[PDB]
Motif scaffolding. Sequence first.
Motif, PDB file in Angstrom:
ATOM      1  N   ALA A   1       3.308   3.737 -16.245  1.00 14.02           N
ATOM      2  CA  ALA A   1       4.023   2.541 -16.374  1.00 14.02           C
ATOM      3  C   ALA A   1       4.248   1.866 -15.321  1.00 14.02           C
ATOM      4  O   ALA A   1       3.848   0.634 -15.071  1.00 14.02           O
ATOM      5  CB  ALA A   1       5.234   2.853 -17.508  1.00 14.02           C
ATOM      6  N   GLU A   2       4.699   2.690 -14.174  1.00 15.92           N
ATOM      7  CA  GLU A   2       5.102   2.138 -12.866  1.00 15.92           C
ATOM      8  C   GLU A   2       3.834   1.626 -12.518  1.00 15.92           C
ATOM      9  O   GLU A   2       3.690   0.398 -11.774  1.00 15.92           O
ATOM     10  CB  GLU A   2       5.657   3.331 -11.949  1.00 15.92           C
ATOM     11  N   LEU A   3       2.672   2.316 -12.382  1.00 19.09           N
ATOM     12  CA  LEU A   3       1.388   1.740 -11.891  1.00 19.09           C
ATOM     13  C   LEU A   3       0.988   0.466 -12.570  1.00 19.09           C
ATOM     14  O   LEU A   3       0.369  -0.246 -11.993  1.00 19.09           O
ATOM     15  CB  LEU A   3       0.336   2.826 -11.988  1.00 19.09           C
ATOM     16  N   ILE A   4       1.048   0.451 -13.699  1.00 20.08           N
ATOM     17  CA  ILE A   4       0.541  -0.719 -14.335  1.00 20.08           C
ATOM     18  C   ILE A   4       1.387  -1.984 -14.070  1.00 20.08           C
ATOM     19  O   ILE A   4       0.856  -3.062 -14.266  1.00 20.08           O
ATOM     20  CB  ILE A   4       0.662  -0.581 -15.977  1.00 20.08           C
ATOM     21  N   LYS A   5       2.611  -1.846 -13.526  1.00 20.19           N
ATOM     22  CA  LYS A   5       3.488  -3.087 -12.935  1.00 20.19           C
ATOM     23  C   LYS A   5       2.547  -3.570 -11.944  1.00 20.19           C
ATOM     24  O   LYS A   5       2.741  -4.850 -11.559  1.00 20.19           O
ATOM     25  CB  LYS A   5       4.673  -2.559 -12.845  1.00 20.19           C
ATOM     26  N   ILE A   6       1.803  -2.747 -11.194  1.00 23.00           N
ATOM     27  CA  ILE A   6       1.306  -2.989 -10.090  1.00 23.00           C
ATOM     28  C   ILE A   6       0.078  -3.573 -10.289  1.00 23.00           C
ATOM     29  O   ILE A   6      -0.801  -4.540  -9.437  1.00 23.00           O
ATOM     30  CB  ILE A   6       1.087  -1.858  -8.786  1.00 23.00           C
ATOM     31  N   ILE A   7      -0.846  -3.056 -11.256  1.00 26.78           N
ATOM     32  CA  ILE A   7      -2.409  -3.307 -11.482  1.00 26.78           C
ATOM     33  C   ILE A   7      -2.601  -4.491 -12.347  1.00 26.78           C
ATOM     34  O   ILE A   7      -3.931  -4.624 -12.439  1.00 26.78           O
ATOM     35  CB  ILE A   7      -3.039  -1.835 -11.030  1.00 26.78           C
TER      36      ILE A   7
ATOM     37  N   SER B   1       0.921  -1.340   0.009  1.00 28.63           N
ATOM     38  CA  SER B   1       0.040   0.002   0.059  1.00 28.63           C
ATOM     39  C   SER B   1       0.947   1.128  -0.073  1.00 28.63           C
ATOM     40  O   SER B   1       0.340   2.397  -0.358  1.00 28.63           O
ATOM     41  CB  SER B   1      -1.132  -0.131   1.234  1.00 28.63           C
ATOM     42  N   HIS B   2       1.996   1.319   0.658  1.00 27.80           N
ATOM     43  CA  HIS B   2       2.856   2.353   0.631  1.00 27.80           C
ATOM     44  C   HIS B   2       3.471   2.790  -0.553  1.00 27.80           C
ATOM     45  O   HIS B   2       3.366   3.854  -1.236  1.00 27.80           O
ATOM     46  CB  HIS B   2       3.935   2.148   1.568  1.00 27.80           C
ATOM     47  N   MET B   3       3.741   1.696  -1.336  1.00 25.17           N
ATOM     48  CA  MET B   3       4.307   1.883  -2.833  1.00 25.17           C
ATOM     49  C   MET B   3       3.008   2.497  -3.547  1.00 25.17           C
ATOM     50  O   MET B   3       3.344   3.242  -4.595  1.00 25.17           O
ATOM     51  CB  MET B   3       5.003   0.703  -3.625  1.00 25.17           C
ATOM     52  N   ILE B   4       1.699   1.819  -3.504  1.00 20.71           N
ATOM     53  CA  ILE B   4       0.831   2.431  -4.230  1.00 20.71           C
ATOM     54  C   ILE B   4       0.534   3.768  -4.038  1.00 20.71           C
ATOM     55  O   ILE B   4       0.230   4.503  -5.066  1.00 20.71           O
ATOM     56  CB  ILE B   4      -0.462   1.412  -4.116  1.00 20.71           C
ATOM     57  N   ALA B   5       0.496   3.816  -2.807  1.00 17.95           N
ATOM     58  CA  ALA B   5       0.337   5.433  -2.635  1.00 17.95           C
ATOM     59  C   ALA B   5       1.093   6.302  -2.883  1.00 17.95           C
ATOM     60  O   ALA B   5       1.008   7.631  -3.452  1.00 17.95           O
ATOM     61  CB  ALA B   5       0.084   5.664  -1.049  1.00 17.95           C
ATOM     62  N   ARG B   6       2.507   5.878  -2.950  1.00 18.28           N
ATOM     63  CA  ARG B   6       3.658   6.933  -3.730  1.00 18.28           C
ATOM     64  C   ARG B   6       3.372   7.200  -4.944  1.00 18.28           C
ATOM     65  O   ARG B   6       3.261   8.237  -5.542  1.00 18.28           O
ATOM     66  CB  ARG B   6       4.949   6.317  -3.244  1.00 18.28           C
ATOM     67  N   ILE B   7       3.051   5.956  -5.806  1.00 18.78           N
ATOM     68  CA  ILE B   7       2.968   6.151  -7.418  1.00 18.78           C
ATOM     69  C   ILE B   7       1.554   7.161  -7.541  1.00 18.78           C
ATOM     70  O   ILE B   7       1.438   8.034  -8.433  1.00 18.78           O
ATOM     71  CB  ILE B   7       2.784   4.963  -7.760  1.00 18.78           C
ATOM     72  N   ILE B   8       0.584   6.791  -6.797  1.00 16.45           N
ATOM     73  CA  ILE B   8      -0.719   7.378  -6.921  1.00 16.45           C
ATOM     74  C   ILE B   8      -0.462   8.974  -6.696  1.00 16.45           C
ATOM     75  O   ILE B   8      -0.970   9.942  -7.349  1.00 16.45           O
ATOM     76  CB  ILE B   8      -1.795   6.984  -6.037  1.00 16.45           C
TER      77      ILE B   8
END
Length: 242
Positions: free
Chosen positions: A235-241, A2-9
Motif C-alpha cells: 500500500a505504501e508503494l502504491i502511493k508512490i507508483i 529515491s531514498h524513500m523508494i529504496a526504503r519501501i522496496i
Amino acid sequence: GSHMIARIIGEIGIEGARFIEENIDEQFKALRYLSKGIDSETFVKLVIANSLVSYQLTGKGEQWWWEFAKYFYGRDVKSIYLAYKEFLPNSRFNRRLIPQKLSRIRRVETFLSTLTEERIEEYYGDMSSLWGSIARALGVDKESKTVVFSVKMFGYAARIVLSTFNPYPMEIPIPEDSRIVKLTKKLTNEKPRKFWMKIARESGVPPLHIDSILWPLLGGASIDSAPPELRDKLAELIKIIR
Ligand SMILES: [Cl-]
Ligand code: NA
Ligand code: NA
C-alpha cells in the motif's frame, strides 16, 4: 524520492518480491498453467523463445503470456521454430514483425537444444552465464530489448520446474518497457536503468526483483492477496507508483 523508494522496496525485500511473483504476477500464473501441460524441458525452451519475441505486441503482456500458455498446453512440439511459424500469424496478441521474430527464434534453436534438465539447473544457479549464452546466440547486445526479460522469464520457469528459488543477480538491469519507462518519467528525469540500479543497490533488491514488484502493480493488480504485513508495505508503494 529515491531514498524513500529504496526504503519501501527494501522492506518488501526478496520475500515480498517472491510472494508477488508466485501469487500475483499473471505471467507467472500463465507459466505455472503451461507447466502442467507440457514437459519441463520443452516448457523452459518455449518460455525463452516466447520472451525473445515479446516486443511490439498486439496486446498487453498479461494477455500475450496467457495466449502462449493456452496455445502450448497439451501440444507436441517437435521444432520450436516451426511451432512459432504456425503460432504467431494465427495469434491474437503477437501478429506484427513476424519475420524478425522468427529469425530470432531460428538463431537460438541450437542454444535451446542444449537445455537439458541439468543444464537448466546449472543456468538457474548462474543466471549471469545464461544472460550471455542467450545474447551471444542471438548475436545482440546483452541489454537490447527482450534479452534481460528472457532471463527474468527463465527464472520464473526454472523456479516452477525445479521447485527451488534462486534470486536474480544484482547486475542484471531492469527491463525498459513502456510501463517502467512511463513510471520512471513520473519519478525522475534519470534514465530508468540507472535510476533503478541505484535503488537496487540501496535496497539490496536486485533490479529484476524490483521489476517483479512493480510490473503487476503498474498493470492494476490487486494487493489484497498479500499477507497483512506485506499488504501494508505494498500500500505504501502504491502511493508512490500509482
Ligand atoms: Cl555479450
Ligand atoms: Na513442466
Ligand atoms: Na527487456
